[PDB]
Scaffold this motif. Structure first.
Motif, PDB file in Angstrom:
ATOM      1  N   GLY A   1       0.811  -1.250   0.000  1.00  0.00           N
ATOM      2  CA  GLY A   1       0.000   0.000   0.000  1.00  0.00           C
ATOM      3  C   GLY A   1       0.830   1.279   0.000  1.00  0.00           C
ATOM      4  N   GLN A   2       0.190   2.386   0.394  1.00  0.00           N
ATOM      5  CA  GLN A   2       0.867   3.682   0.419  1.00  0.00           C
ATOM      6  C   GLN A   2       2.057   3.661   1.362  1.00  0.00           C
ATOM      7  OE1 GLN A   2       0.672   5.804  -1.729  1.00  0.00           O
ATOM      8  NE2 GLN A   2      -0.071   7.830  -1.094  1.00  0.00           N
ATOM      9  N   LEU A   3       1.898   3.061   2.537  1.00  0.00           N
ATOM     10  CA  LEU A   3       3.023   3.001   3.462  1.00  0.00           C
ATOM     11  C   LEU A   3       4.177   2.223   2.862  1.00  0.00           C
ATOM     12  CD1 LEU A   3       1.236   2.347   6.877  1.00  0.00           C
ATOM     13  CD2 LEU A   3       1.910   4.542   5.931  1.00  0.00           C
ATOM     14  N   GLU A   4       3.881   1.114   2.170  1.00  0.00           N
ATOM     15  CA  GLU A   4       4.946   0.326   1.568  1.00  0.00           C
ATOM     16  C   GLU A   4       5.635   1.094   0.451  1.00  0.00           C
ATOM     17  OE1 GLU A   4       6.518  -2.128   2.349  1.00  0.00           O
ATOM     18  OE2 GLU A   4       5.327  -3.310   3.769  1.00  0.00           O
ATOM     19  N   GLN A   5       4.874   1.840  -0.346  1.00  0.00           N
ATOM     20  CA  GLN A   5       5.486   2.668  -1.380  1.00  0.00           C
ATOM     21  C   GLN A   5       6.436   3.677  -0.759  1.00  0.00           C
ATOM     22  OE1 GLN A   5       2.838   0.702  -2.615  1.00  0.00           O
ATOM     23  NE2 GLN A   5       1.519   2.259  -3.553  1.00  0.00           N
ATOM     24  N   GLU A   6       6.014   4.308   0.329  1.00  0.00           N
ATOM     25  CA  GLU A   6       6.871   5.280   0.990  1.00  0.00           C
ATOM     26  C   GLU A   6       8.131   4.644   1.551  1.00  0.00           C
ATOM     27  OE1 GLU A   6       4.778   8.079   3.575  1.00  0.00           O
ATOM     28  OE2 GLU A   6       2.913   7.469   2.595  1.00  0.00           O
ATOM     29  N   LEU A   7       8.038   3.432   2.066  1.00  0.00           N
ATOM     30  CA  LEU A   7       9.207   2.783   2.644  1.00  0.00           C
ATOM     31  C   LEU A   7      10.184   2.402   1.556  1.00  0.00           C
ATOM     32  CD1 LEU A   7      10.547   1.778   5.217  1.00  0.00           C
ATOM     33  CD2 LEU A   7       9.300  -0.356   4.971  1.00  0.00           C
ATOM     34  N   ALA A   8       9.676   1.862   0.434  1.00  0.00           N
ATOM     35  CA  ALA A   8      10.546   1.579  -0.701  1.00  0.00           C
ATOM     36  C   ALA A   8      11.260   2.843  -1.163  1.00  0.00           C
ATOM     37  CB  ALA A   8       9.747   0.993  -1.859  1.00  0.00           C
ATOM     38  N   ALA A   9      10.580   3.993  -1.175  1.00  0.00           N
ATOM     39  CA  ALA A   9      11.214   5.229  -1.610  1.00  0.00           C
ATOM     40  C   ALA A   9      12.325   5.624  -0.668  1.00  0.00           C
ATOM     41  CB  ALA A   9      10.184   6.334  -1.731  1.00  0.00           C
TER      42      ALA A   9
ATOM     43  N   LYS B  18      17.408   7.411   7.796  1.00  0.00           N
ATOM     44  CA  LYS B  18      17.320   6.163   8.537  1.00  0.00           C
ATOM     45  C   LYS B  18      16.327   6.251   9.686  1.00  0.00           C
ATOM     46  CE  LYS B  18      21.510   3.914   7.132  1.00  0.00           C
ATOM     47  NZ  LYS B  18      21.054   2.523   7.350  1.00  0.00           N
ATOM     48  N   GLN B  19      16.226   7.399  10.354  1.00  0.00           N
ATOM     49  CA  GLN B  19      15.219   7.544  11.399  1.00  0.00           C
ATOM     50  C   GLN B  19      13.813   7.511  10.810  1.00  0.00           C
ATOM     51  OE1 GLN B  19      16.060   7.837  14.997  1.00  0.00           O
ATOM     52  NE2 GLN B  19      17.635   6.827  13.756  1.00  0.00           N
ATOM     53  N   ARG B  20      13.587   8.205   9.698  1.00  0.00           N
ATOM     54  CA  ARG B  20      12.279   8.151   9.047  1.00  0.00           C
ATOM     55  C   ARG B  20      11.924   6.737   8.627  1.00  0.00           C
ATOM     56  NH1 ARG B  20      11.998  12.041   4.352  1.00  0.00           N
ATOM     57  NH2 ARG B  20       9.842  11.309   4.441  1.00  0.00           N
ATOM     58  N   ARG B  21      12.914   5.983   8.135  1.00  0.00           N
ATOM     59  CA  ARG B  21      12.687   4.630   7.699  1.00  0.00           C
ATOM     60  C   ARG B  21      12.299   3.758   8.886  1.00  0.00           C
ATOM     61  NH1 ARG B  21      13.756  -1.046   7.646  1.00  0.00           N
ATOM     62  NH2 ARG B  21      13.942  -1.628   5.438  1.00  0.00           N
ATOM     63  N   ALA B  22      12.993   3.901  10.013  1.00  0.00           N
ATOM     64  CA  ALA B  22      12.678   3.081  11.182  1.00  0.00           C
ATOM     65  C   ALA B  22      11.280   3.388  11.710  1.00  0.00           C
ATOM     66  CB  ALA B  22      13.706   3.292  12.265  1.00  0.00           C
ATOM     67  N   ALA B  23      10.897   4.657  11.702  1.00  0.00           N
ATOM     68  CA  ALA B  23       9.593   5.039  12.221  1.00  0.00           C
ATOM     69  C   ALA B  23       8.469   4.495  11.342  1.00  0.00           C
ATOM     70  CB  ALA B  23       9.484   6.538  12.365  1.00  0.00           C
ATOM     71  N   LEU B  24       8.669   4.489  10.030  1.00  0.00           N
ATOM     72  CA  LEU B  24       7.698   3.930   9.097  1.00  0.00           C
ATOM     73  C   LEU B  24       7.643   2.409   9.190  1.00  0.00           C
ATOM     74  CD1 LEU B  24       5.675   4.205   6.801  1.00  0.00           C
ATOM     75  CD2 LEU B  24       7.543   4.580   5.273  1.00  0.00           C
ATOM     76  N   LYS B  25       8.799   1.759   9.326  1.00  0.00           N
ATOM     77  CA  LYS B  25       8.819   0.318   9.536  1.00  0.00           C
ATOM     78  C   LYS B  25       8.001  -0.063  10.758  1.00  0.00           C
ATOM     79  CE  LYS B  25      12.075  -3.268  11.101  1.00  0.00           C
ATOM     80  NZ  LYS B  25      13.475  -3.478  11.576  1.00  0.00           N
ATOM     81  N   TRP B  26       8.141   0.687  11.849  1.00  0.00           N
ATOM     82  CA  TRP B  26       7.388   0.379  13.061  1.00  0.00           C
ATOM     83  C   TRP B  26       5.905   0.577  12.817  1.00  0.00           C
ATOM     84  CZ3 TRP B  26       6.757  -2.655  16.769  1.00  0.00           C
ATOM     85  CH2 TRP B  26       6.007  -2.332  17.899  1.00  0.00           C
ATOM     86  N   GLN B  27       5.524   1.627  12.088  1.00  0.00           N
ATOM     87  CA  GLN B  27       4.113   1.803  11.778  1.00  0.00           C
ATOM     88  C   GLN B  27       3.575   0.591  11.040  1.00  0.00           C
ATOM     89  OE1 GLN B  27       2.882   5.291   9.601  1.00  0.00           O
ATOM     90  NE2 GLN B  27       0.717   4.715   9.768  1.00  0.00           N
ATOM     91  N   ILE B  28       4.302   0.138  10.015  1.00  0.00           N
ATOM     92  CA  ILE B  28       3.858  -1.003   9.225  1.00  0.00           C
ATOM     93  C   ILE B  28       3.704  -2.244  10.101  1.00  0.00           C
ATOM     94  CG2 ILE B  28       4.492  -2.566   7.375  1.00  0.00           C
ATOM     95  CD1 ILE B  28       5.712   0.041   6.002  1.00  0.00           C
ATOM     96  N   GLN B  29       4.656  -2.486  10.997  1.00  0.00           N
ATOM     97  CA  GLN B  29       4.661  -3.676  11.836  1.00  0.00           C
ATOM     98  C   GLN B  29       3.721  -3.570  13.023  1.00  0.00           C
ATOM     99  OE1 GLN B  29       8.707  -4.436  13.009  1.00  0.00           O
ATOM    100  NE2 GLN B  29       9.408  -4.840  10.914  1.00  0.00           N
ATOM    101  N   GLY B  30       3.084  -2.431  13.233  1.00  0.00           N
ATOM    102  CA  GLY B  30       2.168  -2.273  14.349  1.00  0.00           C
ATOM    103  C   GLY B  30       2.934  -2.166  15.646  1.00  0.00           C
TER     104      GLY B  30
END
Ligand code: NA
Lengths: 30, 30
Positions: A1-9, B18-30
């Motif tokens: 989804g949108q979150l996954e697109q953002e993470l890939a970016a 890298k901080q933005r990536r970690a924060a988004l990864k945590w969102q995705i993983q709940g």
């Protein structure tokens, strides 16, 4: 989804910046 | 010099992404 697109970016940008950093360090360090 | 200032800038950007990536990864993983 949108979150996954953002993470890939973010992952692509991080990979490209790490490569630019390695090339700049090589220039600076000779 | 100019090249080292560019390097410090890349260092800051990579760390911040890298901080933005970690924060988004945590969102995705709940
Ligand atoms: Na470094």
């Amino acid at each position: 989804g949108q979150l996954e697109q953002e993470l890939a970016a973010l992952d692509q940008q991080i990979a490209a910046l790490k490569q630019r950093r390695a090339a700049l360090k090589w220039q600076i360090q000779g």
